[PDB]
Amino acid sequence: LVPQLSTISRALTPSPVMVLENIEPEIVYAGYDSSKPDTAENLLSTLNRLAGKQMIQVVKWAKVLPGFKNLPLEDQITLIQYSWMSLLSFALSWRSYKHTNSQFLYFAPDLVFNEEKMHQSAMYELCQGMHQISLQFVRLQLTFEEYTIMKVLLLLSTIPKDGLKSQAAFEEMRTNYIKELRKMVTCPNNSGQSWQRFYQLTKLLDSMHDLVSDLLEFCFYTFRESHALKVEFPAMLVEIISDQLPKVESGNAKPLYFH
């Protein structure tokens, strides 16, 4: 009988972490036009346009993310919709860390926020919050490997209060990626140092919930008063926020914590 299991294939397939590196989206440009006054209406509209372009790349990434296709299609869609802000804000801190040593907020190569832009955007306190996350990346010396696994965990960090179509399939993928992170933090065996770091990384993931809650509060507010505020949103964000706003505001979004 022909062996159905292929030792060669299992040994040859890239590790999950290696696949994450391979499928990570290339950098996206904001299309920022410096001729426009740096007022909140203009800066915020630009950030919304950038967000739409980033999400187009996020969905392509999710399509080839190992294990994600094992979840019901409706759950894949649900998870992207509930995690979008966490994913984009986390990636913003990563780009800021890698490209500016966490000195500025690197939204895109053509849109880098310094203190002035943060004030002008009318969301200064929120910019400071994401900047703080960037500063923690330097203190922790976060690695790309760690970052990629953590971004998947954020995709799996908020679920509908009633649950997904397949909680078991979700739980399997989540436990698998948590395992990857645990192995990632372990040569020189030192359980103590390994657990201390694992703890630092899960505390940071947990801290994303409060930050994301505040970012969404601002997002939903500007969306609701888009006309009065003159803040424009691209189709992709109208699609996402139109779905998310009522679900989050009615208390249906359940955060998953490590601590």
Place this chain on the structure above:
Amino acid sequence: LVPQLSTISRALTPSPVMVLENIEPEIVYAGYDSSKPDTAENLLSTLNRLAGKQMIQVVKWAKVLPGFKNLPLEDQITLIQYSWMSLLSFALSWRSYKHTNSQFLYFAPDLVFNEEKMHQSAMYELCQGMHQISLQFVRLQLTFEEYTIMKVLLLLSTIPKDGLKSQAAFEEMRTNYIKELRKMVTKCNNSGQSWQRFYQLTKLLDSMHDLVSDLLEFCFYTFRESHALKVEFPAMLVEIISDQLPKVESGNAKPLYFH
């Protein structure tokens, strides 16, 4: 030829957790005499006598603890000497939890401390500290299985600053028992709840270091002034403290933390 492998033996061998249950020491009596006044000198001397009897059982337990025999003998002796206070204080909170719902400190069947004895012992604050751990066992609904594994982790929680004869053998055993706790807190699937409990238990373990440091400070103090204070110590404790006092006080005891 005669098969050297025994399928039967493999199948019948109990799990490590079952072995921990099987080797748990039987309860020890203090030999408390209520006819004598409850002065600090009498109460502390009785607790020291109890401690000696308890350590005799701890050494018998360590001899049959799975994996411990794999470490160099020098390291087995060292770990027992560095962890004695953590093991005895943790076991005290366990008995208090199981026998009095954490209302009192159950040192032994014949010596249960209520607030009055805590004051009379002249170590009131320290008693409150161990009492708080007892109270945490109720809040967390600690199980006997969780307790036996955590007790082994405490045995492996303090090492010489220099280092053990075999850090690799030590690390292997510590990792194996951490793995046991990890699997023990798994539910039937819910990583969120499973990690939250693992976090609660490791934070509890970490909290034992500060409590133990304070208990040891009091112990070393009473030990060096035993004559003036009229506090007696049995041979077993004179042996343990004579070894530990200078090592701990010179900064050679390195606590291992999860957080």
